[PDB]
């Protein structure tokens, strides 16, 4: 019967759980027709991690493994195959009951970052190193992290080494152009295009009419081109971390929370925090929620599903 709590954190002290970014705004989009079923930042209110969700902020959209060889590919640039391990270096077992190695990206797009290597062999017995900008196309048929390997491309033409430990540090997107297939709500095919994704965290949606999902939104950097892409998560990484630590039993399917302004002690609006780990609000518009960034959600009480939220 441990009481349920959220951390006391300003919006500026929250991290996106789907890409390593600060949270920039709360956000609604009630006319979204896509199915919302992201796999990172998934955690039940009683602390069960789901999908590909792991606890490290540095693990979100990261890969660890080994380049096996250069490969041939139509598209621009140079291409490389790498095996991927678990984030802590232990081999990934594709029969593990997860959709893919924990931290694997959960959306279609060209993910821009840096590939770096530190050789295992040995110069003062000091290993050789290199790092280069890289792009991982998660929509591609060669993106098969559930099978233990992925592809990435570089602008660099040859300075990537086979058989050496490899790390991908995510930075942003390469492009949001038409042929870059950015869609934050389309899952990758974790095993390749003709195979079913498995062990997925469930989709989320409002049920009571008049309600919509409330997202923690971050704007994601672009390597070049035009656009203002954003990534919406259901709960910031710090809530994932806190809920996991607390392991508090959920006393209903819906926790009523209030967004409070500590400068005034007042509630700005209320929201439903649902057992599976997401928020709904009674809002009839899209766009940012304009609220003091010093404010924060506070747990009020457990309510039933038929509770009527005061409109925002």
């Amino acid at each position: 019967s441990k009481p349920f709590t959220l951390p006391i954190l300003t919006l500026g002290e929250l991290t996106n759980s789907r890409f390593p970014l600060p949270i920039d705004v709360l956000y609604t989009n009630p006319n979204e027709s896509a199915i919302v079923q992201c796999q990172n930042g998934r955690c039940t209110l009683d602390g069960e991690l789901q999908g590909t969700t792991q606890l490290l902020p540095t693990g979100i959209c990261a890969f660890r493994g080994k380049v096996t060889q250069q490969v041939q590919d139509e598209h621009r640039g140079t291409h490389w195959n790498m095996t991927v391990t678990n984030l802590n270096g232990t081999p990934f077992d594709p029969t593990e009951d997860v959709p893919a190695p924990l931290g694997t990206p959960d959306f279609s797009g060209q993910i821009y970052g840096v590939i770096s290597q530190r050789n295992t062999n040995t110069e003062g017995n000091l290993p050789a190193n290199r790092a280069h900008e890289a792009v991982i196309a998660t929509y591609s048929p060669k993106f098969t992290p559930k099978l233990g390997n992925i592809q990435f491309s570089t602008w660099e033409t040859q300075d990537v080494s086979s058989g050496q430990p490899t790390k991908f540090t995510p930075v942003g997107l390469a492009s949001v152009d038409a042929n870059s297939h950015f869609d934050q709500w389309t899952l990758p095919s974790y095993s390749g295009a003709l195979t079913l994704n498995m062990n997925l965290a469930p989709s989320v949606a409002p049920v009571f009419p008049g309600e919509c999902l409330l997202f923690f939104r971050s704007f994601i950097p672009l390597k070049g081109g035009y656009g203002n892409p954003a990534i919406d998560c259901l709960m910031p990484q710090e809530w994932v971390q806190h809920l996991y630590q607390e392991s508090a039993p959920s006393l209903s399917d819906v926790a009523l929370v209030r967004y409070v302004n500590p400068e005034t002690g007042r509630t700005l609006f209320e929201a439903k925090l649902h057992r599976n780990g997401f928020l709904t609000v009674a809002r009839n518009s899209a766009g940012p929620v304009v609220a003091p960034t010093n404010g924060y959600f506070r747990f009020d009480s457990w309510v039933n599903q038929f509770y009527t939220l005061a409109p925002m």
Epitope: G47, E48, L49, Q50, D93, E96, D97, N199, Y244, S247
Partner: nanobody, 126 residues
């Protein structure tokens, strides 16, 4: 399609050791919590040793603390109860239980688990 199968039990003298095995099918131990209970005739069941999905949190019964340990072989989807020094109090049927999900908490009551095996018998004699 979840099955849990225990083995490794036997007859042993006080001060001896066994290694129990719990193999699973339809479920990977690396993504769920599990626990060992024991059931001797004429005695209420007792929680022995439990662990969460990544092994980062456990519960060990005070009576067995310095004597029982656990290990896992993820490749074999099997976890082990190592009983390094057995006492006469330990005689019982030791069985395996799984609770679905990747969480921190380690449940100590059987009704909170989702699956159990039949067990394997352990007798400490002389």
């Amino acid at each position: 399609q979840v099955q849990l199968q225990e083995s490794g039990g036997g007859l042993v003298q006080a001060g001896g050791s066994l290694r129990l095995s719990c193999a699973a099918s339809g479920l990977t131990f690396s993504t769920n919590g599990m626990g060992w209970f024991r059931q001797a005739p004429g005695k209420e069941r007792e929680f022995v040793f439990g662990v969460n999905w990544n092994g980062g949190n456990s519960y060990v019964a005070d009576s067995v603390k310095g004597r029982f340990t656990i290990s896992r072989d993820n490749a074999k989807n099997t976890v082990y109860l190592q009983m390094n020094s057995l006492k006469l109090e330990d005689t019982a049927v030791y069985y395996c239980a799984a609770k679905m999900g990747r969480r921190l908490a380690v449940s100590r009551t059987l009704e909170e688990y989702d699956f159990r095996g039949q067990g394997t018998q352990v007798t400490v004699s002389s």
